[PDB]
Amino acid sequence: QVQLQESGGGLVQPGGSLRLSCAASGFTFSDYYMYWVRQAPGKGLEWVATISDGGSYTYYPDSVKGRFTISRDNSKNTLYLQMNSLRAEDTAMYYCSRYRYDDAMDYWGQGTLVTVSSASTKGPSVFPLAPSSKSTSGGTAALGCLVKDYFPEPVTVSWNSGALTSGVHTFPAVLQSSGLYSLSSVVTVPSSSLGTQTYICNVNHKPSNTKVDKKVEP
């Protein structure tokens, strides 16, 4: 079915350049106008650029004119966005979108985050969060993972390789004074399986190529 894979996001220095791409699939790509929309962390949606069917025409708001270039490769069914002279104000989640003849963007990419900062990349440290024995909520035991000191965003925390999704809570990351992020991921399990079964949390920080598999147990 119609799907848009975006890639190319990540950390990049202010004044730097970065290219996002969107591999279209499941529809006659050359028959549609493509859009790039962005969302500053915590803020709303802003239009970034538009390009016609064959790349003939393109449009940008004045805040992007001359800095970003939208283009496409119809033979490879790919949409691109070459950014230049990036600034903190450009950090945000970027989405590609298909535009129907009826003037409606019906399919969007999952999105790719662009953090524009001079700060340096730091892999996260993973400390366990085992359930104390004094803690007994009846039949449920809560245990989690503590992912501290990393940059930039984001971080992916799963349990028992995505096999354990039910009841998991991965809180949004908070920025610490130092200047790094931190977040916790907990899951509630039946205290009757604490020793019975093995619980491992899968952490992945793609911007630093870190993939830890910390194991927890009281």
């Binding site: 003037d103 409606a104 440290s125 503590l146 990351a173």
Partner: protein, 216 residues
Amino acid sequence: EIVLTQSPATLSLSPGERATISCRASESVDSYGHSFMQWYQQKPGQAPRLLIYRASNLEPGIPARFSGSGSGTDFTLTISSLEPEDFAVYYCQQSNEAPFTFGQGTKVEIKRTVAAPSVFIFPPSDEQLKSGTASVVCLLNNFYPREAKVQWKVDNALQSGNSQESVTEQDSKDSTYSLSSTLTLSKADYEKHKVYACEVTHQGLSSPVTKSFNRG
């Protein structure tokens, strides 16, 4: 630029209730005999999803509970009967003038019945204790409303300016929330003390509850 102002900014309604969100455009969105107003639904960690286009057309695949209307400069989005999965930020979008624009968005919270938080506390794990820094985490799991209070106590000493909170987005299944409070102390402070307590005050608790542990 056509400015789209949505109203209200935030909406809190119980499932089954009818929700109405408005959008007023500074200049007409009407051209060629049609209103080019779209409505999008954006959930946490996801891309905006198209609900309605050209003002009143339901997007195939979208439940019939969603509908839109209006024209000219005034538009309305309706959810005839809320479900816990409708928790999301809604945006009106204009496709008629020079630069496309989105409204500022309306945050829709699903009103759920009072739910008391299950409190948990985690002492800093041996590993982090070797790093010369201590992090104590207090967990408030599955509650509603969102307003809660968490005071830290180290040997009856009320902490201050040394804890950070992070609350999850409302659950789309049961509409509850979960909260996390981390207390960061040096390895020295943590070792020179023993009673670590987390006092939580919430509407679902007839009396504030305290969860604690003694180091080691």
